[PDB]
Amino acid sequence: ALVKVDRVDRRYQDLVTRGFNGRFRGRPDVVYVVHTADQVVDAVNQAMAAGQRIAVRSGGHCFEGFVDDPAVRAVIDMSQMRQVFYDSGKRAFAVEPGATLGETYRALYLDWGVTIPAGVCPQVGVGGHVLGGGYGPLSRRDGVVADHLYAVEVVVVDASGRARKVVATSAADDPNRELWWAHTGGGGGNFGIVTRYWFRTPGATGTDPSQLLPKAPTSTLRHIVTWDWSALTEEAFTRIIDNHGAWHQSNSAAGTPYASMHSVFYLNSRAAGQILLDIQIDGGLDGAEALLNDFVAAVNEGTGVEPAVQRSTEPWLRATLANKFDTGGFDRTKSKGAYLRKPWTAAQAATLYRHLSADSQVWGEVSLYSYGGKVNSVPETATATAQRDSIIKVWMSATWMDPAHDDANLAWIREIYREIFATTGGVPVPDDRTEGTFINYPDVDLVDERWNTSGVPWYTLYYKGNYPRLQKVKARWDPRDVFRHALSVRPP
Ligand SMILES: CC[C@@]1(O)C[C@H](O[C@H]2C[C@H](N(C)C)[C@H](O[C@H]3C[C@H](O)[C@H](O[C@H]4CCC(=O)[C@H](C)O4)[C@H](C)O3)[C@H](C)O2)c2c(cc3c(c2O)C(=O)c2c(O)cccc2C3=O)[C@H]1C(=O)OC
Ligand SMILES: *Cc1cc2c(nc3c(=O)[nH]c(=O)nc-3n2C[C@H](O)[C@H](O)[C@H](O)COP(=O)(O)OP(=O)(O)OC[C@H]2O[C@@H](n3cnc4c(N)ncnc43)[C@H](O)[C@@H]2O)c(*)c1C
User: Fold this and answer.
1) For ligand 2, is residue 134 a contact (CB within 6 Å)?
2) For 382-415, what is the HEC assignment?
3) Is there a single domain that holds both residue 367 and residue 453?
4) Which of 20, 135, 280, 363 to mutate to test the pocket of ligand 1 (most atoms within 8 A of CB)?
5) Chain center to CA of 60
């Protein structure tokens, strides 16, 4: 289909409210619904000629709703572009940005029995997920998704003011390899518009597609372990915390049995009823069941309370395609993350318990992700995802329904964060204990001095020593600063 232009058209509301986060709703003059890269070129050229500030939506999961900022006048929506295929020529797999993770997972698996180590949520977009290095349950095993990025097709704009389509590959002799590099965890609205991504494991021989990317697990064995809040004490919570963290520091970053395990520890508040440890592993590996109960046995060894355990073995795709991320009306969110190099302290664990145990008036939680593994095998400088020596990733949030309570919710999430990172100035500064935070977790509070961040800039936080190299890319492929937003890479 030819390019579509949505201006005071009946399709407007639907397009402007596609964002995941109900807090931010767009008001651009127009939305362009694109179907080909050439259409993307046209749309860009039309907005520049109208001086419409551009934004791209693929998946709409942007936690900070950047695309829906009131300064945006042009929104290019890629949701009609979700083609996925293999190219025998290129020895690579075709995936368009409009595709959902759930769709790519299903297409890659059924035709070839393979996958990519991407995120968990099935409705997440490929478009703004891969270029910032979205990770998931198989990262431990196979690394970041961008560890399997061969090439990217992008629409960029000339110093002369011209939109152009360009291809950037990971070949050493490719003059655009720095553009490819930029797309391996530089993040979303900075370098142009990706129209197609190419995947192949750098260690991949031959012409057989089934052996050109990691193979899906035989099955998914799951244990959900839950501990009720009423039987939880500050002391037992802390043993659990300290126990969890000591294990993650001993068990990861290699190609071992436990490299294939993933867990999320949902540290819910005292309204939620319980804290939940959600663990999974390939049901086809030897003594699979044994590694899982050995881990939880390590998790609550010095504890005073005994958890519940629910076990199940399901087909990998079925388990993978659960829409168990139901918003349930509570569509407003605020969140903030961190990369841990070493476990929380005695004091941080205690910050955690008090703020979670409290009769807050808001739905708060702390999630801890098992991490490391194969991701830690790539040199920090080898991709634009620098964080390559962390053992756990954390994501903290508040979720609500009524905008009248934005103030109470916002207060909550900021307070827990600043307090556990208080010894630095309320932020996870890359040092011997952390490695900053994750670009797909934007937090514009990182640029507010009337809060946290003591002495360290936001870009140190997200990219460490990799930022200058990203600045030089910004200048070469987007000299006119056509692609920007609040937490945007700046030219030097
Ligand atoms: C599941 C049922 C219910 O809990 C749903 C809802 O709870 C959230 C929890 C998550 N959140 C945003 C952190 C979930 O995010 C998702 C998507 C996210 O983007 C997250 O995904 C991660 C996963 C991995 C990543 O790396 C990363 C950051 O994203 C998360 C794991 O799950 C999701 C959207 O749902 C919820 C409920 C009940 C109440 C609230 C809820 O939010 C309330 O918020 C609330 C209140 O504010 C005031 C009074 C009462 C209540 C409630 O009773 C339940 C329900 O709705 O059924 C009726
Ligand atoms: C909603 C949500 C997000 C999740 C979830 N789980 C994740 C996980 O398991 N691992 C992760 O690593 N990340 C997870 N995320 C967090 C992230 O939001 C996602 O990984 C992605 O950011 C989602 O991207 P997308 O859905 O495409 O959202 P958009 O708002 O459209 O884009 C975000 C960002 O990217 C830019 N952008 C979009 N499209 C393009 C193109 N084609 N080219 C360049 N840049 C693009 C946007 O402008 C914006 O800046 C689980 C849940 C439920």
Assistant:
1) yes
2) CCCCCCCCCCEEEEEEEEECCHHHHHHHHHHHHH
3) yes
4) 363
5) 13
Both tokens of 197, joined, read 């991504």
Tokens of 311: 């076990």
Q: Is residue 265 part of a domain?
A: yes
Q: Which residue has the tokens 């070469």?
A: 476
Residues 207 and 302 grouped into a single domain: no
Q: Is residue 399 marked as binding?
A: yes
Residues 43 and 158 in one domain: yes
Q: What is the DSSP secondary structure assignment for residue 341, as one 8-state letter?
A: S
Output the CA 274–ligand 2 centroid distance in Å: 29
- Does any ligand 2 atom lie closer than 6 A to the CB of residue 82? no
155 in the same domain as 43? yes
Q: How far is CA 142 from the centre of its chain?
A: 16
Residue from 4, 159, 142, 144 nearest 439 by CA: 144
Q: Which two tokens stand for residue 452?
A: 């946290």
PDB resolution in Å: 1.6
**Domain check: are 105 and 71 in the same one?**
yes
How many A from CA of 125 to the centre of ligand 2? 6
Residues 56, 58, 59: CA angle, nearest 5 degrees? 130
Residue 333 Cα to ligand 1 middle (Å): 9
Domain count, the chain: 2
Could you tell me the residue range of the domain that residue 418 belongs to? 218-465
Q: Are both 171 and 189 inside the same structural domain?
A: yes
